[PDB]
Amino acid sequence: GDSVEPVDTDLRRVDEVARSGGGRALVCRIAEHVQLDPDLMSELKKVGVVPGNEIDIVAVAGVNKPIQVQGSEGGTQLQPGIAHAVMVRVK
Amino acid sequence: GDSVEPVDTDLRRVDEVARSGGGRALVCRIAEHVQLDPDLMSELKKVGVVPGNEIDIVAVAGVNKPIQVQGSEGGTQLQPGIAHAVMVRVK
Amino acid sequence: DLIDTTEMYLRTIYDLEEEGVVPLRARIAERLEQSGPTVSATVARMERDGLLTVAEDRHLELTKAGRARAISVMRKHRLAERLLVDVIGLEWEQVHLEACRWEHVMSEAVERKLVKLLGNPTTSPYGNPIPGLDELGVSVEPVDTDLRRVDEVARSGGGRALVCRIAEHVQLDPDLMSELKKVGVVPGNEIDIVAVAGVNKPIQVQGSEGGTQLQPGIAHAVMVRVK
Amino acid sequence: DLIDTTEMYLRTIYDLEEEGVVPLRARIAERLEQSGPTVSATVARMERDGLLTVAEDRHLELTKAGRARAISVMRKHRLAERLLVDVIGLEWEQVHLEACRWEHVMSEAVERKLVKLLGNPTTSPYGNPIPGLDELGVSVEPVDTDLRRVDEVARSGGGRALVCRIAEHVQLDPDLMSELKKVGVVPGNEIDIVAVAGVNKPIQVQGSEGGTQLQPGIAHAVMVRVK
Amino acid sequence: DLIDTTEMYLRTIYDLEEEGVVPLRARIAERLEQSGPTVSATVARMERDGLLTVAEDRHLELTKAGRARAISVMRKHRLAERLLVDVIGLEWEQVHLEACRWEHVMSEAVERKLVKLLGNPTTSPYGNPIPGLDELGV
Amino acid sequence: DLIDTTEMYLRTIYDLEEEGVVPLRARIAERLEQSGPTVSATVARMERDGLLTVAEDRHLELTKAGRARAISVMRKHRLAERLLVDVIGLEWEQVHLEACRWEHVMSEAVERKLVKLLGNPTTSPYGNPIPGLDELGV
DNA sequence: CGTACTTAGGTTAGCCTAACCTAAGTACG
DNA sequence: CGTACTTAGGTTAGGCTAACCTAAGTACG
Ligand SMILES: [Co+2]
Ligand SMILES: [Co+2]
Ligand SMILES: [Co+2]
Ligand SMILES: [Co+2]
Ligand SMILES: [Co+2]
Ligand SMILES: [Co+2]
Ligand SMILES: [Co+2]
Ligand SMILES: [Co+2]
């Protein structure tokens, strides 16, 4: 089940990467939870957080704190639940 | 099934006795059809047409003609459907 | 099969009043083993026909007509029970279920004939008073304030008491009624109610021919006079 | 499963109008295979919500709102059918049943995108006109007075005719739709309708690839232009 | 009104057989004061449930199960009539209408008790034989 | 609103597993905006029908049948999303909500036609893998 | 040419499950 | 002391059969 347990073991959650000291990573998956908010999905498109776009995740400390990410067309803040629901591969 | 086909073959219908030329007969059965009219059942009791009472049946001709019967306490007129539904043994 | 849905809803509300229970639709669903939607729709149909009203706190209130009809059914029920026990000799545990059908088909004409035959009876064979005898055209009403529920007697510290009433609720279980008869928890028999603490605990009772356990809802429906 | 009971009742009334049938509750019962009581209760619920009214002669009349909603559903249905045939390539006989579910979930947003994708289509793959395109924000309306029902053509002495419309009623039977496709009774094909006498007799038709029999209710739902 | 539609249709067919009348649906319509369509629909439902069959000449024929149930109802009816007359003392003319309701609610358990109470009666108070006493075990 | 309650409960449990979240009834209440009592009653109904079981630690465990149905719904969802983006051209942010309704009405017949049309896609437009393509025969 | 029955389209009463709700509890780190 | 869940008593939508009706037909000596 590539969908539940990724075949690409190197796939990591945005929050997990951020809490592990940020990094440059390629957006891979955006879970159905994130998709539920359109206004957010409009934002995610606008700043260039879409599958197959390289992004920079800002290092963060403390759970229940929003995660900053920089895309090609600018940056934005993710909620912990949201950042948990976005997977990437670090480069 | 004594109720449908009598064990006592001599049991005959009031109308059948009447059309066969009347006769003195003992009231044996009063079918559930007759019972449906109380006012009638009151009359039948009053004039002495009840099981275990001898009655005289007036000889009649033509169906759809009401049958005259004489009981201990007087007489009365039966409808064909009523007289058909009363069984007796002729003395 | 209920035979008559309306009459059984009315008598079930009456039963709940006699058991000192708040007559909710939830109670009828349990008792008659019908779905919530069924009960609400049937109660709405009875409300429309002016036999009851649903209060704000949602307890069912019988109208003048509703109470009159409920009494009529209950009267037929307990006269039937008297006839079945005293005359026909049907077994004590089978009588209620029979009477629960008969209550729907009996005319006032027969009721008046049963009153004479049974010598103007005032209570059922299970000790429950026969109402609406005034409406038949037939006595000093027993002061029954001294009667206490077996569950409440048990929670208050138990003691010896005389069995007076077994409510309709209890009669629905024939196997239980057979158990009650054997050990001797029947109207006009003395029993010892064992003390219990807290609500919804099964009450232990000791009859003349042994003892048994009653569920909280069963003990609530058995009424006694404490010695 | 209907997915949406209300929308299917509305579209069934619309279907009956298109087939020139009197929209009675009896028609909805047979079409959607539901009991008389079910249909009356559901129609009463739609009447209460102001989507239709029951006339004195008992025929169902859609309100302004009812017709608007019925058109909306039918529009979604025939756009779905177009998409399924022209783009997705689902088999001709399976398309209606698929579209009969899709009609209940499609947004106007998607409808507008399908209009562009399918090049502003005006008829379904079965020749039925697509209504309510004005409401979407999209043509000269075909004079369809020349169209005659296969049953009526057969009773009037038969003859050669071009197949124009297969109504929703006919589409419900996939096995039949497969038979129609094989022998070649499809929109834009010429057929020879054999003459019959007396109503409610099965009509014989001769397609390009052989012939077949249509029931009176099926023949009534197929519309043709006689040569 | 009838209390049990099925049982009353069965007993009405039984009544007609006792009266030596051809049990047609037309007879049931008259007797129970119901419309032709009602009777045909109810008879079709009883045919489907295997309680009777409509013959070629269209007279109603009770099945084994239908006759067994019809006898059961009639037995209850006439035992009720006996009880109402001999014990309760209801007026002779009112008994049938009462017994016509009671026939639908009486258990075999009560029937067996009434047999003992009434001293194994073989006829109703109106002289009609009580059938299916064999099936009670008396 | 949900179109199919059962399918949406199954897919919501599947969503939570993909997100590495513990699938509790509390999570379904939040996600589908339904009361706690509603969710417990609906989950009990799905447990009875053998689509899931409530564990000791009270996390929801899909049965063989439950998982098979959940996959089926998710597969339909992501194939619908592909169609809506690549072919129909619905806006990127509106696609999911559309696909969340379409997932309940799509036959396997259409799924197989979409597989061919979209050139055997393995992921949704949001990069989420499409499961149960084996069960289509792709 | 009535007698018996069918066809067609209703009706109310009395049942059901699925699927939503609130208000006020219990159980547990 | 919130987090998760149960207990208790509702609700509407959407299904069902049984059992009644009328109005206007058909079938048959
Ligand atoms: Co009782
Ligand atoms: Co009762
Ligand atoms: Co179609
Ligand atoms: Co549909
Ligand atoms: Co009688
Ligand atoms: Co009767
Ligand atoms: Co999605
Ligand atoms: Co969905």
Numbering used by the authors:
A (entry chain aa), B (entry chain dd): 141 to 231
C (entry chain B), D (entry chain C): 3 to 140, 143 to 231
E (entry chain A), F (entry chain D): 3 to 140
Paper text:
When testing the affinity of IdeRQ43A for the consensus sequence with EMSA, we did not observe any significant differences compared to IdeRWT (apparent KD ∼65 nM), demonstrating that the hydrogen bonds between Gln43 and the DNA bases are not important for the recognition of the DNA target. It is unclear if the water molecule bound to the second cytosine is lost due to the mutation or not observed as a result of the lower resolution of this structure, but it is clearly present in one of the four IdeRQ43A subunits. No additional interactions were observed in the crystal structure of this complex, corroborating that the base contacts of Gln43 in the recognition helix of IdeR are not required for correct target recognition and binding. However, we note that no loss of cooperativity is observed for IdeRQ43A, thus ruling out that this residue is responsible for cooperative DNA binding.
The main function of IdeR is to repress the expression of iron uptake genes when the intracellular iron levels are sufficient. When iron levels are sufficient for iron ions to occupy the IdeR metal-binding sites, the regulator is activated and recognizes a highly conserved 19-bp sequence located in the promoter region of its target genes.
